[PDB]
RNA sequence: UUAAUAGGGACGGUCGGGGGCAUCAGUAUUCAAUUGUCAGAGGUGAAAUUCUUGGAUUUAUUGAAGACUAACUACUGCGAAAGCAUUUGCCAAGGACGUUUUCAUUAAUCAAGAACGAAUAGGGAUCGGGUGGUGUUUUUUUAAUGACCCACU
């Protein structure tokens, strides 16, 4: 649970910015 | 007065200038299509 | 539009041509208003002048509610009194210009004047090819709604007192000079009083009429159509009112103590079809009660009885084409379906009533997620199902109607499409548990939906009512488009 | 209710407006809380124009220590705004036959609650009033769709 | 059928918590239903199917409105009688200044509650001023006089014309 | 089961008003008020005269055919005394004792 | 030569029934019209004044007007006071808090004169801000704003 999915969707936002 | 009907005329020309111009070019093209030639007129 | 200066009183479409157009606009350049104000100016463009003519023809009546006064030798003055005839009256020459026009030709001319005026008021789409480059009078089946083929074998003149139901004596030769003028006027009156508000407009056509004949003859001689008069047959062309055409009861005068004039014209006009009825509001009226048909409208029967009663016993009215177009409709397995009119949608209404009986029961069930919407998107809800909805006829593919189902906006919807559609599935399992729990008259099961590519987990809820109809339920959420555009 | 078309001791009627009791709006306004109201005017599918109302009251929670628990007056600028788009997405589609049917189980009030929860939750919220002003035309034929 | 309900502040809460039994005793004499909500802080009276005369629920409304503004209960139970008329006077919407509101409230009650009690002798009424309200029970013309004097006291009209005026009117009725 | 209307008692000061109307409300029936049946000008809102006028209104009600009714009580309100009169109870008591039917009444102050 | 718990200035998230301008909702009152209806209606301690069968009162409908934001509304918040409570938008402005930003005593108090106005140190509560959280909740939605509560200032 949470922390890992927040890391993955954190990487998804990393793809959202650039 | 003349200024009031002048404003009505300019406002109405503003209201119909679009289809007046495009429909006017349609008038030029269609009257270019349906025009009689003069040599047939002298012929009759 | 087939409009010309030719005599429309002979059963043609005309009376108003280019010459009457130029007299009309030339009269508009010398007034035209009610208080003799000028409608058109000499400094206008041809769109402004022509638009003023179409606006005058669309807005100002010259037949019933007014006429136009003008001077050929002084301002044009519109008068609000009509002579029950298309009236365009010169004072200098005392000539009514529109004498060649009939009443229906002027009402149809005003109708095309209003259609054309609305097309000139369109500022989005182009109507140039519509107004000036489209032929509507090439085919009457496109121009008109109905066309009745009327055969009239009238023979000679001395046969007319035996073949015409009316009397063509001296006075009809005085006012109505020919046979075809009193014929078109008479059939126009019988058909106009016969239908009334079931239609909107009508033209009567003498098919096969001629205006040319050689120098070796005195007049046009003919023998075709069973008579020696200048037509083959008579076509009845009809512009149909959609709101009042297929009603069961042709309305007549109200029944009172003393018989009025209109009740004598009514009962004289219908005879055995003239009757009395208490309406729904309790009014006792003279009327006519008819029967609808899925093969033909009532209008053919009214024109048939009116022309075979009041014009000629030898008339042969035929329109089998519209009978074919009604007959190629798939006749649904319903009681009195053959005696059901084409505009009736009562089976769709019964599916709507059974759907609302379903809607009240399902829409008030208790759930962990409250239903946002139960929205029908079926073809039978937009009345386009190719087969009309028959109870218990499940073999048709338009039987199960699709219904959109929406729950409350809640974060209980997962972030993966298979578990999302399986959550919709388990929600439909709770719906089926309540439905089979307490509404066992409604039958139900589950099916797959694989018409959407690569989403094999869509499960539709199929419900069969004791009214004999079936629905498939599908669920739409707000997480859907996020996952699809996400994908 | 609004009276439209009769047939011989058989008179249909149309919706005219939603009303609320006296006592309860005199009852629901408690001391030491925050009163929030809203309205908008909008055109529907057929061009019925209605001014809807919306009233909103704040609740207290479990284990609250203080006695008042008001809002912060910038939440209220947000919550009045948040409600406003929820009102417009509901309306202008599939009029009173479905719209009044949405009003009866107060699904829309729960939809308000589904969005308001991220700011400050609330209590009883109702719409409490609706009115009609701009019905276009009679339309007896579509009025007979509700009739059987 | 009919459901009348009102609220209460939380300092009255313990008192009504102690006497709600006698509330539903004087209330059960008239065959009415009632519930007490703690988390709302409300009292709700509702009619039963076994009621004799329904109109008393209006009185019951006033009665729980009497408990809405902290009226003592043996004084409050007079409203169920026939010859009783009551009045809650809301005095909030007159002055924006809280200072002048204290000036006119303290001016109304007078020093030591004398002048207020004077009204309770001049109108022969029970008057219990609760914050932004003024409680009045008793005769009907007495309620006309109390509402007249209070609604003239929230303005700049000095009440000595009312004490002296009803002082005249009491002695003229003696004669 | 019954025919229904609204009675709409307007209990004001110095007189109390009643007018039993139809369910639409625009059509009134048998209005006659309390001050009519007394000539003293002081007891126009008394409960004793309120019982007399409401008995007469209940008399003319069943004489037409109306058998059941609701009521909407109404004090003066607005900027006024906001409180129902004495005979507003006595109007409601006299018609209920007459034998009419009552259900779900409300306030329109 | 420092950068005062002297003063002043800058920025950030803000805060306010703070001001100026604009827009809008609500019912009430009065008046006019239409409908049902038809001898009384206002008023006082009663008297008296007032209205009325061209129908008074009331009912239901519509328009108009000016006025205001009823419960919540507090020993709360703002303004130097005079004063400031409908939605929404614009326009500057203000303080506090935060700050490892800037000048450097530029300061404090007051006749004359100006404008506006009739003319000692704890206890508890609460407002605004900030910070910490072996904290909760909204979270079957990945996250996360927000509220809540403990503690500090």
PDB file of N, CA, C and O in Angstrom, chain B residues 9 12 15-16 18-20 23 26-27 30 33, chain C residues 44 46-47 51 120 122-123 125-126 128 132-133:
ATOM      1  N   UNK B   9     -30.077  52.908 -41.402  1.00  0.00           N
ATOM      2  CA  UNK B   9     -29.595  52.407 -42.686  1.00  0.00           C
ATOM      3  C   UNK B   9     -28.175  51.858 -42.579  1.00  0.00           C
ATOM      4  O   UNK B   9     -27.861  50.814 -43.167  1.00  0.00           O
ATOM      5  N   UNK B  12     -28.358  48.618 -40.587  1.00  0.00           N
ATOM      6  CA  UNK B  12     -28.933  47.521 -41.359  1.00  0.00           C
ATOM      7  C   UNK B  12     -27.966  47.041 -42.438  1.00  0.00           C
ATOM      8  O   UNK B  12     -27.899  45.842 -42.740  1.00  0.00           O
ATOM      9  N   UNK B  15     -25.793  44.931 -40.760  1.00  0.00           N
ATOM     10  CA  UNK B  15     -26.449  43.665 -40.443  1.00  0.00           C
ATOM     11  C   UNK B  15     -26.511  42.729 -41.647  1.00  0.00           C
ATOM     12  O   UNK B  15     -26.578  41.507 -41.472  1.00  0.00           O
ATOM     13  N   UNK B  16     -26.496  43.268 -42.868  1.00  0.00           N
ATOM     14  CA  UNK B  16     -26.647  42.437 -44.058  1.00  0.00           C
ATOM     15  C   UNK B  16     -25.473  42.529 -45.033  1.00  0.00           C
ATOM     16  O   UNK B  16     -25.615  42.101 -46.186  1.00  0.00           O
ATOM     17  N   UNK B  18     -22.612  40.945 -45.002  1.00  0.00           N
ATOM     18  CA  UNK B  18     -21.968  39.650 -45.224  1.00  0.00           C
ATOM     19  C   UNK B  18     -22.630  38.888 -46.370  1.00  0.00           C
ATOM     20  O   UNK B  18     -22.001  38.609 -47.404  1.00  0.00           O
ATOM     21  N   UNK B  19     -23.920  38.576 -46.215  1.00  0.00           N
ATOM     22  CA  UNK B  19     -24.659  37.893 -47.270  1.00  0.00           C
ATOM     23  C   UNK B  19     -24.937  38.823 -48.445  1.00  0.00           C
ATOM     24  O   UNK B  19     -25.245  38.357 -49.547  1.00  0.00           O
ATOM     25  N   UNK B  20     -24.842  40.138 -48.231  1.00  0.00           N
ATOM     26  CA  UNK B  20     -24.948  41.076 -49.343  1.00  0.00           C
ATOM     27  C   UNK B  20     -23.732  40.982 -50.258  1.00  0.00           C
ATOM     28  O   UNK B  20     -23.861  41.018 -51.487  1.00  0.00           O
ATOM     29  N   UNK B  23     -23.605  36.965 -51.481  1.00  0.00           N
ATOM     30  CA  UNK B  23     -24.746  36.785 -52.373  1.00  0.00           C
ATOM     31  C   UNK B  23     -24.646  37.715 -53.577  1.00  0.00           C
ATOM     32  O   UNK B  23     -25.164  37.408 -54.654  1.00  0.00           O
ATOM     33  N   UNK B  26     -22.434  35.971 -55.911  1.00  0.00           N
ATOM     34  CA  UNK B  26     -23.302  34.967 -56.523  1.00  0.00           C
ATOM     35  C   UNK B  26     -24.170  35.575 -57.621  1.00  0.00           C
ATOM     36  O   UNK B  26     -24.453  34.918 -58.631  1.00  0.00           O
ATOM     37  N   UNK B  27     -24.610  36.822 -57.428  1.00  0.00           N
ATOM     38  CA  UNK B  27     -25.379  37.529 -58.452  1.00  0.00           C
ATOM     39  C   UNK B  27     -24.511  37.796 -59.678  1.00  0.00           C
ATOM     40  O   UNK B  27     -24.955  37.631 -60.823  1.00  0.00           O
ATOM     41  N   UNK B  30     -23.951  34.322 -61.439  1.00  0.00           N
ATOM     42  CA  UNK B  30     -25.147  33.747 -62.048  1.00  0.00           C
ATOM     43  C   UNK B  30     -25.621  34.585 -63.231  1.00  0.00           C
ATOM     44  O   UNK B  30     -26.020  34.043 -64.269  1.00  0.00           O
ATOM     45  N   UNK B  33     -23.658  33.754 -65.976  1.00  0.00           N
ATOM     46  CA  UNK B  33     -24.067  32.506 -66.615  1.00  0.00           C
ATOM     47  C   UNK B  33     -25.246  32.708 -67.561  1.00  0.00           C
ATOM     48  O   UNK B  33     -25.247  32.181 -68.679  1.00  0.00           O
TER      49      UNK B  33
ATOM     50  N   UNK C  44     -31.829  50.986 -54.080  1.00  0.00           N
ATOM     51  CA  UNK C  44     -31.520  49.724 -53.423  1.00  0.00           C
ATOM     52  C   UNK C  44     -30.793  48.778 -54.368  1.00  0.00           C
ATOM     53  O   UNK C  44     -30.802  48.957 -55.590  1.00  0.00           O
ATOM     54  N   UNK C  46     -30.340  44.734 -55.815  1.00  0.00           N
ATOM     55  CA  UNK C  46     -31.308  43.729 -56.249  1.00  0.00           C
ATOM     56  C   UNK C  46     -31.648  42.751 -55.133  1.00  0.00           C
ATOM     57  O   UNK C  46     -32.738  42.165 -55.132  1.00  0.00           O
ATOM     58  N   UNK C  47     -30.730  42.551 -54.186  1.00  0.00           N
ATOM     59  CA  UNK C  47     -31.052  41.765 -53.001  1.00  0.00           C
ATOM     60  C   UNK C  47     -32.024  42.514 -52.102  1.00  0.00           C
ATOM     61  O   UNK C  47     -32.894  41.910 -51.467  1.00  0.00           O
ATOM     62  N   UNK C  51     -35.614  41.184 -51.941  1.00  0.00           N
ATOM     63  CA  UNK C  51     -35.923  40.835 -50.559  1.00  0.00           C
ATOM     64  C   UNK C  51     -37.138  41.608 -50.057  1.00  0.00           C
ATOM     65  O   UNK C  51     -37.918  41.098 -49.245  1.00  0.00           O
ATOM     66  N   UNK C 120     -33.782  33.897 -46.497  1.00  0.00           N
ATOM     67  CA  UNK C 120     -33.025  35.141 -46.582  1.00  0.00           C
ATOM     68  C   UNK C 120     -32.607  35.630 -45.205  1.00  0.00           C
ATOM     69  O   UNK C 120     -31.649  36.402 -45.081  1.00  0.00           O
ATOM     70  N   UNK C 122     -31.472  33.602 -42.944  1.00  0.00           N
ATOM     71  CA  UNK C 122     -30.428  32.710 -42.459  1.00  0.00           C
ATOM     72  C   UNK C 122     -29.066  33.347 -42.709  1.00  0.00           C
ATOM     73  O   UNK C 122     -28.731  33.689 -43.848  1.00  0.00           O
ATOM     74  N   UNK C 123     -28.279  33.503 -41.644  1.00  0.00           N
ATOM     75  CA  UNK C 123     -26.949  34.090 -41.741  1.00  0.00           C
ATOM     76  C   UNK C 123     -25.850  33.064 -41.481  1.00  0.00           C
ATOM     77  O   UNK C 123     -24.691  33.441 -41.287  1.00  0.00           O
ATOM     78  N   UNK C 125     -26.034  29.281 -42.954  1.00  0.00           N
ATOM     79  CA  UNK C 125     -25.932  28.400 -44.111  1.00  0.00           C
ATOM     80  C   UNK C 125     -26.262  29.155 -45.391  1.00  0.00           C
ATOM     81  O   UNK C 125     -26.850  30.240 -45.353  1.00  0.00           O
ATOM     82  N   UNK C 126     -25.873  28.577 -46.525  1.00  0.00           N
ATOM     83  CA  UNK C 126     -26.179  29.174 -47.819  1.00  0.00           C
ATOM     84  C   UNK C 126     -27.438  28.540 -48.401  1.00  0.00           C
ATOM     85  O   UNK C 126     -27.614  27.319 -48.350  1.00  0.00           O
ATOM     86  N   UNK C 128     -28.513  29.671 -51.673  1.00  0.00           N
ATOM     87  CA  UNK C 128     -28.521  30.156 -53.051  1.00  0.00           C
ATOM     88  C   UNK C 128     -28.890  29.049 -54.029  1.00  0.00           C
ATOM     89  O   UNK C 128     -29.761  29.226 -54.892  1.00  0.00           O
ATOM     90  N   UNK C 132     -32.466  29.327 -56.062  1.00  0.00           N
ATOM     91  CA  UNK C 132     -32.414  29.583 -57.493  1.00  0.00           C
ATOM     92  C   UNK C 132     -31.890  28.433 -58.341  1.00  0.00           C
ATOM     93  O   UNK C 132     -32.017  28.500 -59.568  1.00  0.00           O
ATOM     94  N   UNK C 133     -31.309  27.392 -57.749  1.00  0.00           N
ATOM     95  CA  UNK C 133     -30.693  26.332 -58.535  1.00  0.00           C
ATOM     96  C   UNK C 133     -31.236  24.942 -58.226  1.00  0.00           C
ATOM     97  O   UNK C 133     -30.564  23.952 -58.535  1.00  0.00           O
TER      98      UNK C 133
END
